[PDB]
Amino acid sequence: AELPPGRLATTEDYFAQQAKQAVTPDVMAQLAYMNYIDFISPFYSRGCSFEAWELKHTPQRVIKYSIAFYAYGLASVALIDPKLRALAGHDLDIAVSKMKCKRVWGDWEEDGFGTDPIEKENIMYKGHLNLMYGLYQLVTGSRRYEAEHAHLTRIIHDEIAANPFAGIVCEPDNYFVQCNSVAYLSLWVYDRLHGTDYRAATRAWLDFIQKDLIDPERGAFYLSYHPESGAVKPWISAYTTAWTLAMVHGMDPAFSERYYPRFKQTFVEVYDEGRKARVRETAGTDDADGGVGLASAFTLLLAREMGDQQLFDQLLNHLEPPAKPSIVSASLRYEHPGSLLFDELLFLAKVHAGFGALLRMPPPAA
Amino acid sequence: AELPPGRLATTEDYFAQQAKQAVTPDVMAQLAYMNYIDFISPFYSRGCSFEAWELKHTPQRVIKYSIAFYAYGLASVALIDPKLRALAGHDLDIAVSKMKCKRVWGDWEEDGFGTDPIEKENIMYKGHLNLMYGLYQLVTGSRRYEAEHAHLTRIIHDEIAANPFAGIVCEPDNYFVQCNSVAYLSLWVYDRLHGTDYRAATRAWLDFIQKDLIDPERGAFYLSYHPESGAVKPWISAYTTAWTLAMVHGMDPAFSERYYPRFKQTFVEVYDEGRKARVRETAGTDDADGGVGLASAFTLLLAREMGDQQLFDQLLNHLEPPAKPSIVSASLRYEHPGSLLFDELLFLAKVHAGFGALLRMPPPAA
Amino acid sequence: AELPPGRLATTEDYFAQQAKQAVTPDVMAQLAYMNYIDFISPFYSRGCSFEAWELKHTPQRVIKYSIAFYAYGLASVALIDPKLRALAGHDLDIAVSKMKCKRVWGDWEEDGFGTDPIEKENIMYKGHLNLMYGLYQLVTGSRRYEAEHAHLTRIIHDEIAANPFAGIVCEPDNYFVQCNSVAYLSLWVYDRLHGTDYRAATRAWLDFIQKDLIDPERGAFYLSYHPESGAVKPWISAYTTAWTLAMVHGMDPAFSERYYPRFKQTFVEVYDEGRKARVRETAGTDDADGGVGLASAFTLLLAREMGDQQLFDQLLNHLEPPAKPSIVSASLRYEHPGSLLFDELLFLAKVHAGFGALLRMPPPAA
Amino acid sequence: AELPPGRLATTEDYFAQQAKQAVTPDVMAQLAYMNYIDFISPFYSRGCSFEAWELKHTPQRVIKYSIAFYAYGLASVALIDPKLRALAGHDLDIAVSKMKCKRVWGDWEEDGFGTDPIEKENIMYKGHLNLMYGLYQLVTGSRRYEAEHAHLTRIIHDEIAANPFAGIVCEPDNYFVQCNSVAYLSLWVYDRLHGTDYRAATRAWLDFIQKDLIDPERGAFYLSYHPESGAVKPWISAYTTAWTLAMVHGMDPAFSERYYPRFKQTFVEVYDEGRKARVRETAGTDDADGGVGLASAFTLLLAREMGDQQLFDQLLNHLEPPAKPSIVSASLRYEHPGSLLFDELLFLAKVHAGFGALLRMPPPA
Amino acid sequence: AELPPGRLATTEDYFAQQAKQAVTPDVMAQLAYMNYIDFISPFYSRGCSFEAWELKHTPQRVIKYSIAFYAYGLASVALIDPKLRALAGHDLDIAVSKMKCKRVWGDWEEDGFGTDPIEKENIMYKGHLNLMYGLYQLVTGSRRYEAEHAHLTRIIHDEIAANPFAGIVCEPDNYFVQCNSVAYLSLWVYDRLHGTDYRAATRAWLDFIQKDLIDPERGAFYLSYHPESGAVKPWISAYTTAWTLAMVHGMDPAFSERYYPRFKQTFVEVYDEGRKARVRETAGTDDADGGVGLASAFTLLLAREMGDQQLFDQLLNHLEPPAKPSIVSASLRYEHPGSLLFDELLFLAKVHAGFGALLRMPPPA
């Protein structure tokens, strides 16, 4: 219809991008922020320079997630506009390269866990890296990283097969359903590119997480599981659940469709006479966006994945105007980003074509 | 029954937790602060990351005590609620793992005393670690640290046996009763897990400390003893005495029952028409909480250990309201912590089941 | 023939310098800034001291360009006034020497690209160095850098020869037309000095960049090209185009004469009743000098190259007055430089004799 | 007169401590500052941690003097109260240990003079260390550092024996009478402890310094002497003279008694209707406490040594109130110390029993 | 005797010091600043400590000149008052030692020129060091540095003999006439001390700088010369010229007497009804003391060297009062030093006995 005060385009416009085979003008301006200025734009160089993240005060531990969410958005841009597919592929190439720099993964070694960030555990880093390898090849058709993708995929597969519980831990003795969801999605992508059936393990993982790691009544996952002590931390998490449901919807749509209504009841607050919405991070509080501060932003991605245009509009009306977007020299900027990973996640939500459609992305024109 | 101004829960409610088999909501919110947010909560990871302490400005020398006092509080959480015992055990695993990081023990080397922090002396560090080894095993039933526990317990026992005075020194030539008190309690915990009689050394230690290291009429220990010169520092200390009497009460309850009312006469100032109290750190002053600033907070622990609900309420009415507690997103914060180790010591005193009860904690049956 | 506030000499006087065989007094005052004060002037010593650049807050990635644009201006100074030819030669010797300091090229290593900055790729650096080598020898008698010049020229020639596309990438997988224009110009200088035909490769390059790297109708180059993915970034760039058209005019005057009118219509905004002009950096914006902020400054150099006295006057009337020039002790300073590389590019544009003229520099004495 | 605002006890009270065999409450409060709080009190640990000096902004070159002046005061505390003698001995042990930390002597190496701070010259460090070895043993009777004390005493005496002038230098070619006085005093302490006669060299030194190095009419020493060039710097120094006469008074009382009245006439300004005094650092100025800023504080020590209760009272009335003392949790603090080494030198002057008395200290137990 | 507001002594008084055999009280207070306070005075120690310069914010590249200009001043102090000659000699000993510290010469290595600061070129450092060696021995009669002096003098001689132009460069391919003047003056001093004729190379050097490097009508040298390109930088420089003419006056007084009036016409602006003067650094400007900001300060030295009392008084009336000199505890301080090397150059100019007089300095005996 029409756009609220501090909004750049309507929700109708974002949802129509694929049908119209073109990104909106503000999505183009975000692509310009990512690509345009020498040395300081985030996708300027495959080198290990991180000036763009320094300029944004990205904490070191968060750089790997920023790169990953940029990559996931780029993959949908490729699906939206055939004429931007080469550009998206080039940016994905750079994302894989930067992801492998020690600035990005070195917290593993500084925390004392080892010098090799892919060898075992650390799925929080290598789950994303493996998915990125795969999306890069889907987009470009390039075998640049094929040997690396095969090696990391088998490593992930072997870890899963050898655990008594379904899945893999991130750090030693810490298990997170959201990092597992990335890892399993990368198996689906590998199976798409090659003959394989790495995805066969997904069934046992979906059955396992619905047992003790989820509150089926509230449609919400608990914070984390700890296999050695058997502990499940007793708080439910909105950002955890929105992220997980979104990726799971790409592999088993019925699963996410079952819990999504109950999820909204549990965490989502509609206000401003139906015009806006904000998301509580855990139960037993009125406060929105507590904890890591990302409940609302990940629910925006979930709403987009589930095709919920109403909730999408309500969340973006809450999230974007107070941040004060402007476009300068055809480039997107925010004066007051409201959270970590802010331009990254709003970019992803505006373009996201569904993790299922990424799995079914047609071959490049060659 | 009435909630005093500025307080989160009644003293009646804290003391009733174990009987009702549930922590209070503000204790649960302290557990949330300890466990909830990725990367920056203190018990997120077993790696050598200390962001949580950095954000609270904890002095390096104080981190070992922070971790230890959290661990003692978690052991009581395990007794209070069977459903939180797995989480308490997980947190204790992380505590032991963090305790061994060089950030925690490295002052020993930097001061020029040696490269190995458990080898000889340095009881202030290895006393707490040995007790944490034993508490972890009592909570979880896990033998993960058992070889390390055996090794350190024998080091402690051997050192005691070799010394012509009863006990062990901290720094070379510096002897503190409170650090010894931790070391001996760890001997009792070892004997409880195994068949042993290591605790037999306790009687000679208790004889020695009542001879020149205490003023028996004031129920107060002197600051320190220095074996080589024979010197005893001629100032008495409240935080020293409160800590020591609380731990000793778990090994020889009659000892502590004897001195406790004298200690209160010597140091405790009741004010505001009996509603509040604060604790003087040494004799011959009117000033409260001088020196390291922890007389009141350790006396809060001692009041809990001794079953003194009247003094517990008075001290907590003095300590907590001016720190401005609030619960945001189901997690506890203080705007103005009044001392070092503030959330640690309030957490520990609110849940503390008594050191005797910890020593005799039943197995995780069900 | 009149002078607005903040201008130091007329556009007529700048364009007449060569015919008068004398620099303007403000150009002499700029040469004083470059040469006068012990230790802190930029051309005081061949050593690796960069105090002059620290005092101007030059980012280290930009120092190589600062040095190169000084060098290109000095070459025209040698052509303008024979009495300053020896000084200009001395300054060029120092430029080459400083250009080889690790402070200048070391970003290549820190980004992780290698320890040798001329081995392969890195044309953004070694292209400028190779041109500097040649201009030095044209201006002076000297064969000081002759072996280095021959060696690098070969490296560039071989790298062009082995590439499937016309030209050379900067960093890996990143192709920029403006950095290539520098490299190709250096081949023409080498041929001029010796008997060679390295320049024969120019035709293919010019045919190639006119295919997909340029919008023919708008007279504007796209930001960059990336051979591995085949991507051309979809934004056109003014500073890119102005710099490239300026250098190509020295090799194929017809090439640049074809696109110049369209370039001006695309990017240049005339304002203040025809007295001023400023340049938009890309399409679809009204903002001037976005991006790296050098569209106007490089268009100033292009106007000089193309002999466009009206546009030159308009651009200098926009750029110089707000920067507040002053001449103190016969040395030029600016209170408010409006961009990076500010005194470097205004110096170059004021003296620039034309890149074709520099190729045709009459030989020095014996 | 009455006890003025920023004073803590009367001068009569400080001078009567030893008769009464008890320190005053504010002296006890200073010992509490020195000993009480974990990790950050100066005498908490024999380790090479210097957090107490970091908190006071002590320049590194000054830490060696801080530790030594503490040690000289601790020695008198042992003489004053037999019940604090074991504490004083413990603090002296820690003082010797910290004194040997590279944080303390490392300037010798950084300045480029060599890696070993005791083998030659550098009397400014090793003179104090040697005197502290000896005071520790007089206080405790412990033989812990006896071999080191024997080693360093022989080094120092050999150096004296080999020089054409009487004494030793600090830096190469810089000779200071105050650093020499410390070295010679430590020879007397060694003789008191053992059978020896190292002090026999004192007469040639006292003879020598009464020639070129002192202005006998003004009762004041010149800044320094430099043997290779023969140069004697032509300015007189009050802090130099006050420290030197205090220590020499313990070896040759007549020497200091001769020059003390001239010294006072030369440097001391009484003001505020006889209630206060402040000391000019050099001649030809009206300014008090110029130079290193320590004239008044060392003259406070010298007054105590000479038994001049009136000048001691006047100087302490000048020095202590503007520094704003208070006692908090039974520990002494100053909000605005007016010089380097401030709580150190006020501590020393309050307790100082006389260097001759220290020399004659009765065995412990 | 009439004395302007922020002046401490009259020009008549400065020019009379040698005949009266005594320095003025403000010159004595400057020596007090140089020598008095422990650790932080510049001439406290022969070690490689540079606290005095850190406190004054001296740029590292400038420290070699500060030490050198202090040394040249100390040499005149020795000639002025026999009673301060020992002190001046002691201070020169320290100057030579500190000069050899890596903090002083290390810019040579950092710029990438090499690890040995004396073997070739770098006359800007080693010419000063060589002159300092000689002045030390003239003042003291000590042969402490004689072998180093002989060695460096030979190095300089051989480098001159091997060059196709008259003289030596500083940095590679940078020739400066002022730095040459120091080096040639050092050959005269060596000749004075020993039997030799190193100075014979001087005539060819004066012939060369007069032919190519000075504008004889303006009595002013060009900024620099660059042998490999042949470039002479086309600006004339006042501080360059003043420094060079002062030192040349000691070797060929006729040379400097020829250009001095023309130099004053070119650069020196007399103002305030003839009471003051200030010096323009280059031609075609009205700005005073541009560039390195030292034109007036070096012209003050030159006026002293040439005996020009009137111009000396004018320049000091321009330079000293806005810096606000005062005397505190018998030591000289300025609130607002107006340039680099400020107290160094005003010191030097106040005492300077003439470079020829320094060469003829009688033995101490």
Coordinates of C-alpha atoms in Angstrom, one line a residue, chain D residues 61-62 65 110-113 124 171-174 176 178 223-224 226 228-239 281-285 287 289-292, chain E residues 28-39 41 43-51 84 86-91 93-94 101 136 140 144 327-330:
Chain D
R61 CA 64.5 6.7 40.6
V62 CA 63.1 7.5 44.1
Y65 CA 65.1 6.1 48.9
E110 CA 69.0 1.5 31.8
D111 CA 71.3 4.6 32.1
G112 CA 74.0 2.3 30.6
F113 CA 76.4 1.9 33.5
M124 CA 73.6 5.8 46.1
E171 CA 77.5 7.8 39.3
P172 CA 80.9 7.7 37.8
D173 CA 82.7 11.0 38.7
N174 CA 79.8 12.3 40.8
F176 CA 77.9 13.5 47.1
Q178 CA 75.1 12.7 51.7
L223 CA 76.1 20.5 45.9
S224 CA 78.7 18.0 44.7
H226 CA 83.8 15.8 40.8
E228 CA 88.5 14.0 37.7
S229 CA 88.0 17.6 36.9
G230 CA 88.5 18.8 40.5
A231 CA 85.2 20.7 40.2
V232 CA 83.1 21.6 43.2
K233 CA 79.7 22.9 42.2
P234 CA 79.5 26.5 43.5
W235 CA 75.9 26.4 45.1
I236 CA 75.2 25.4 48.7
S237 CA 72.3 23.0 49.4
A238 CA 70.1 22.8 52.5
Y239 CA 68.6 19.3 51.9
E281 CA 67.2 25.2 49.5
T282 CA 70.1 27.4 48.5
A283 CA 71.7 30.9 49.0
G284 CA 70.6 34.0 47.2
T285 CA 66.8 33.3 47.3
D287 CA 62.0 30.8 48.1
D289 CA 62.0 24.3 49.3
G290 CA 63.2 24.8 45.7
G291 CA 65.3 22.2 43.9
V292 CA 64.2 18.7 44.8
Chain E
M28 CA 75.0 32.0 36.7
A29 CA 71.3 31.1 37.1
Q30 CA 71.3 29.4 33.7
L31 CA 74.3 27.3 34.8
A32 CA 72.2 26.5 37.9
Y33 CA 69.3 25.3 35.7
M34 CA 71.9 23.2 33.8
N35 CA 73.5 21.7 37.0
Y36 CA 71.4 21.9 40.1
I37 CA 68.4 19.5 40.5
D38 CA 69.1 15.8 40.9
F39 CA 68.2 13.5 38.0
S41 CA 69.0 18.8 35.2
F43 CA 74.2 18.0 33.1
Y44 CA 73.4 15.8 36.1
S45 CA 74.9 12.6 34.7
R46 CA 77.2 11.2 32.1
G47 CA 74.6 8.4 31.5
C48 CA 72.1 8.0 28.7
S49 CA 69.2 9.7 30.6
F50 CA 67.4 12.5 28.8
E51 CA 64.7 13.6 31.3
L84 CA 84.2 28.4 36.9
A86 CA 86.6 23.3 36.4
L87 CA 82.8 23.3 36.4
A88 CA 82.7 24.1 32.7
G89 CA 85.2 21.3 32.0
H90 CA 83.1 18.9 34.0
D91 CA 80.0 19.9 32.1
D93 CA 82.9 15.9 29.8
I94 CA 79.2 15.1 30.4
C101 CA 74.2 8.0 23.3
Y136 CA 86.8 19.8 26.0
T140 CA 90.6 21.0 30.7
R144 CA 90.5 11.5 27.9
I327 CA 64.8 33.7 38.7
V328 CA 63.4 31.1 41.2
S329 CA 65.6 29.5 43.9
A330 CA 68.7 31.0 42.1

